């Protein structure tokens, strides 16, 4: 009985195998824009994805991951609330069964159709494994997706999804440029949190961009054709793979603008 997003293994059940689900700095959270405070101490955020090198895409039964070669100093996130350099390891999305829901973080309780997570690990810790054992081991850049005009840079991902429909499947996915998934503005909100999926480790500095990117109804509809199940199993569409907002507790959300 593995964790998932269903009635019997969903977010409300995770705390049993992962007690930290009720921890002090869980994610996602609702971003109350009026309570968020502009922080002058934040340095300019730097997203350098020019040398990013993707390797492949995988359906892990929860979402799909576009993984990158993080063996070298390429595709890095720094500045802003971050100290040092964080390296891109993979990105994935969380989406709903309907356009009215799907995002994990919410803005003044507003739910977007989906949310993109670009995961990076603090290079001072050697690698991803050692990083998830640290309070500041990870930095996740979150980007909201709304349904409207198509996002040209996302199509390559959309078109390869047919080959990884079920859990366990992976496919070559080289030369994908994540720069094509970024909105114009880098204005953002930031706060200390956790991974939004088990093991829900609290090693994350969240950086959620204010400006959402637009994707077409057709593009998100293809996300929804994926399966949670493995090949040859009863079909359960991969939708609503998002965790709801958690208690803010002893935390303050800072704005870069
Ligand atoms: C250490 C086990 C694997 C962690 C997977 C991290 C990706 C999922 O987290 S998220 N949604 O970006 O907060
Ligand atoms: Cl279900
Ligand atoms: Zn995520």
Describe the structure in your own words.
The PDB classes it as lyase/lyase inhibitor. Keywords: protein-inhibitor complex, LYASE-LYASE INHIBITOR complex. The assembly is monomeric. The entry is titled "The crystal structure of the human carbonic anhydrase II in complex with an aliphatic sulfamate inhibitor". The protein: Carbonic anhydrase 2. The protein is mainly β and 257 residues long. It has a single domain, classed as Roll (Carbonic Anhydrase II), CATH 3.10.200.10. Helix content is 7%, strand content 29%. The chain has three helices and 15 strands. The protein has helices at residues 128-131, 155-160, 217-223; strands spanning 30-31, 37-38, 45-48, 54-59, 64-68, 76-79, 85-95, 106-107, 114-122, 138-147, 170-172, 188-193, 204-209, 213-215, 254-255. Strands 2, 3, 4, 5, 6, 7, 9, 10, 11, 12, 13, 14 and 15 form a 13-stranded mixed sheet that branches. Strand 4 (54-59) and strand 5 form a beta hairpin. The longest helix has 7 residues, at 217-223. It starts with 29 loop residues before the first strand and ends with a strand. It binds octyl sulfamate, chloride ion and zinc ion. Octyl sulfamate binds at residues 117, 119, 132, 140, 195-197, 199.
């Amino acid at each position: 009985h593995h964790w998932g997003y269903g009635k019997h293994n969903g977010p409300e059940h995770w705390h049993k195998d992962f007690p930290i689900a009720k921890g002090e700095r869980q994610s996602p959270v609702d971003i109350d824009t009026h309570t968020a405070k502009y922080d002058p101490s934040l340095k300019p955020l730097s997203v350098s994805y020019d040398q990013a090198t993707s390797l492949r895409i995988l359906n892990n039964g929860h979402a799909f991951n576009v993984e990158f070669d993080d063996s070298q100093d390429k595709a890095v996130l720094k500045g802003g609330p971050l100290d040092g350099t964080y390296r891109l390891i993979q990105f994935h999305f969380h989406w709903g069964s309907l356009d009215g829901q799907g995002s994990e973080h919410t803005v003044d309780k507003k739910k977007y159709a989906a949310e993109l997570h670009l995961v990076h690990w603090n290079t001072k810790y050697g690698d991803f494994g050692k990083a998830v054992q640290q309070p500041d081991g990870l930095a996740v850049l979150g980007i909201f997706l709304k349904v409207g005009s198509a996002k040209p840079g996302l199509q390559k991902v959309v078109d390869v999804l047919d080959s990884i429909k079920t859990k366990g499947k992976s496919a070559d996915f080289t030369n994908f440029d994540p720069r094509g998934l970024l909105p114009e503005s880098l204005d953002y909100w930031t706060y200390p949190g956790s991974l939004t999926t088990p093991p829900l480790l609290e090693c994350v500095t969240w950086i959620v961009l204010k400006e959402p990117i637009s994707v077409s109804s057709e593009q998100v509809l293809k996300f929804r054709k994926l399966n949670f199940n493995g090949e040859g199993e009863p079909e359960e569409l991969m939708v609503d793979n998002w965790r709801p907002a958690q208690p803010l507790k002893n935390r303050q959300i800072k704005a870069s603008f």
